[PDB]
Amino acid sequence: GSSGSSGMEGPLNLAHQQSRRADRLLAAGKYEEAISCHRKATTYLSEAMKLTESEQAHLSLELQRDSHMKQLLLIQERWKRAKREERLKAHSGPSSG
DSSP, X not given: OOSXXXXXXXXXXXHHHHHHHHHHHHHTTOXXXXXXXXXXXXXXXXXXXXXXXXXXXXXXXXXXHHHHHHHHHHHHHHHHHHHHHHHHHSSXXXXXX
16 A cells, blocks of 8 residues: 555445535534434444454554544534524524514
8 A cells, every 4th residue: 555565445435435424414404414424434443343353453443433433422412502502593483573
């Protein structure tokens, strides 16, 4: 590959394909949709390492996973907040007259 004859070039790209979706959804306020997106990628990552009998390979996973989760927790919280906020800032409910 690049400055090295090793690397987990496989389960990494696949997980990346999903990441994008989650992002494109976040912008559209489709948090929920994104939330899952991460749940899948992560699940697949955790399994990858549970398959590879190499050390380095496992590392590239334990690292990529971190974020895959860091965003999940960030999005989730960013949702429960909007659920109440948005509903407030959004024109809805009872009116004056």
